[model samples]
Target: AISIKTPEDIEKMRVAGRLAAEVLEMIEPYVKPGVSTGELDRICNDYIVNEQHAVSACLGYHGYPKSVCISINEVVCHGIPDDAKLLKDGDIVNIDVTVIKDGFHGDTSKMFIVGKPTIMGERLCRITQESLYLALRMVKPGINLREIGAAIQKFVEAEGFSVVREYCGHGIGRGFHEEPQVLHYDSRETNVVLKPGMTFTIEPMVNAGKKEIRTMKDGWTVKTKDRSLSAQYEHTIVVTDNGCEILTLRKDDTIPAIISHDE
Candidate 1:
């Protein structure tokens, strides 16, 4: 069932979300060649514990060992960080962060390009991120949740990309994962009514090839079945009285054009 967050719950999520956003920003400058995904995870875990005074929600949550979800190249999600998985040039990586503070959980992720990006890879990343932001614009009270996936599927397919159907976005507040699974592709009836104080994530995982996916031998890491590139972007959001607010927003000056269809 969908839980409408209380005012206090909203405040708690805001605090946690702010910390999660800062964690992403903190890792931005450090994402470069020669840095292993494990190194990045260490950096995030240390900062969450010492600097932010928060706990990694993914650590020990349902057997997830790493502090963050590091998806590199074809790996879609749950790519456990390893020092051997060193990032190289022209590689696109997705970093997923979830932090717990004051009894609330905040989850967010973004795709990063290490060193340089191939033409197809760059376009895939751009389209995936755009699909997410575009869907965000339509999130408001009384709107059907299916519209979110519809908007995402339209934009992604228009760009010649496909959306991953297996995994999807979910509610986030007191729990790490909650109700109302948000799909990345179209559906007829997700008849969920968006109300004020509702908090959830709208994460779109777009792929450069068919929607087929395969789980790694570890049974956690998900990757493209055809070895094609994949990208993901996520944000924890709260439905306000009128519209919605992106709680995990960053203050960085590098702003890409986020298409807002509402205006």
Candidate 2:
């Protein structure tokens, strides 16, 4: 069953969301080439625990060793941080952060280009993020949950990208994962109706090549089978009376467009 967050619960989520966003912002400058993924994770972990006075939700969750998931290049998701995993120019990485504050949880992720990205790499990142926003714009009460996936599928495939079908978004609150699995591709498997106070994440992982993926021997890292580039963006949102509110939106957030286009 889907859990409906109380108004008080929503307020607590906002605080958690803001702090998570702030951590992403705090780690922006260090995303350049030469910084190891482990270094970035350490920076974010310290800020969440010391400065924000919050807990890193992923640290030890299901025995996850890192505070943040640092997926680089072909890695799709859950890329465990390693000190030897040094970033290089032209590499693109995804940093996923989840923070818990006052017993509420907020989850979000963003992509970063190590230096200048290739045209194909930039296209993949921008379109993946665009697909996420397109799906988010469709959120509101009385809307079918499948419409979210449909929108993402339409946009992603239209751009010649494939969605990772195996992993999908999930309902979130006091617990990290909850009811209502949010698929990124069109399907009739779920007909759950959206309602007020419904909170979940809409994170789409788009691949520049085929959708097939393989798990690394580490038991956590997922990478594209064809070894092509991949990109992802995530946001936690709540259904409201009119539409939906994006709790994890950052004030400095901007679309990762390689070229300017009118919306």
Candidate 3:
């Protein structure tokens, strides 16, 4: 069963979501070389608690220790932040964040390259985001859940990349991960029709090599099985009558946060 948010709920979500976006914007400067992913976690955690006065939803969710997920290079997702894991030039990093305020949750993530990026590293990130944008543009009332994955898979494969199947986007509201699993590849699973007021996340984990992945001994950390690089982009959105709204949109967004059906 899915929960359709009310106007008041959406208002609360906007605040939580924008606050999550602001967290990403605030951490951009700190994601440079010589910085530790653990340090980045401290910065984001402090800001979420002190600056925004919001609670981090990921800190203890299912025993996830960090306030933010800082996955680097071959780490697909659920990468635990550690001081030993320092940033280096030409490296690709992904920081995923989720903040809760007034009982609503906002989740979003983006890929960051330390200094200069390798050709494939840069290309993979660009194509992964493009795949997300293509999928985002398709969100609106009456669109099937299956179409979201079909579009992402089609575009990603054509670009010479593969989508991770293990982890998918999810519905969000009072809970961090909710129902209506949103896959990044075409699947026969639940052709649940989207409707206005429904909110969920669309996160694509694209691999530079094959799609297979393996979980580290830490149990929480997951990485590419072939040890190839991976990139991911995520956004929490709400279906509108004629379009959708990216609640966690950043100020530096290249694409419009809100898309009308006509546009």
Candidate 4:
């Protein structure tokens, strides 16, 4: 059953989400070539813990050792941070940030180009983000959850990209992971009716090649089995009376315009 969040819970989640967004915005400018993934992790940890007075939700969750998930190039999700994994020009990295503040949890992620991205990488990044907002704009009360993934799958596939069916978005509130798993592909009779105050992520991981993926020996980092690139964008939102509100939106000017409404 889908649990409707209360007004109080929504307020708490908004604050936590804002902190998560701030950390990402602050670290994005430093994601150039020669920067180790470990360095990026430290920057996020410091900002979330010390600067923002929040906690990294992934620190002890499910034995994830890092404060963030830094997936680079072919890495899909849960890429461990290490000094050995230094970013180079033309590399695409996805930074997943989840934070807990004032007793609520917020989750968000986005893809970034390291230094200069190739034409293919840039297009992948753009389309991945585009898919996210397009999905968000279509979500409303009483809508089927299956439609969420179906819409995204259609958009990405139309562009000749693929969506990872293995990992999908999930509900977020007091817990890091909750009910109503948001799939990226349509499954027959798998609809979950959304209601007001419902909250979850709308992250769709888009691959530049076949949708197949493989995991590293660490059992965390997932990458394309074909060794192609992937990108992801996410946001935690509350299902409102009219629509939804993005809790983890950034305030930085350098952030790209990922959402555009045609009049």
Candidate 2 residue runs with Cα over 4 Å from true position: 254-263
What would the per-residue lDDT of candidate 1 be over residues 1-263, giving only the tens digit for each residue?
A: 78999999988998998899899999999999999889999999999999998899899889888999999999999999997788889899999999999999999999889787788888998888788778777887888888788889988888777889889999989988898788877777566878888899989988898899999899799999989999998899988766788888887524322322254
Could you give the C-alpha RMSD of every candidate to the true structure, in order shown? 2.3, 3.9, 1.0, 2.7
Cα lDDT tens digits for candidate 3, 1-263: 69999999999999888999999999999889999899999999999999898899887788888999989999999999997889989899999999999999999999999789899999999999999888889998998989889899999999878889889999999888998799998888758899999999999999998999999899888889989999999999999999899999997778898899874
Show the lowest summed lDDT stretch of 10 residues, model 2.
254-263
Q: For residues 110-165, could you state the per-residue lDDT of candidate 2 as single tens digits? A: 89887888888888988988898887777878889988898898888898889899
**Residue pairs in candidate 1 whose N, alpha carbon or C atoms collide under 3 angstroms:** none
Model 4: per-residue Cα lDDT at residue 107: 94
Tell me the deviation in Å of residue 176 in model 1: 1.0
Can you list the residue pairs that collide in candidate 3? none
lDDT accuracy of residue 74 in candidate 3: 92
> For residues 163-201, what per-residue lDDT tens digits would candidate 4 score against the true structure?
899998999898888887889888885779888889899
Q: Residue 96 CA error for candidate 4 (Å)? A: 0.2
lDDT agreement with native, every candidate: 0.87, 0.88, 0.92, 0.86
TM-score of 1: 0.95
Best by lDDT: 3
Ranking by lDDT: 3, 2, 1, 4
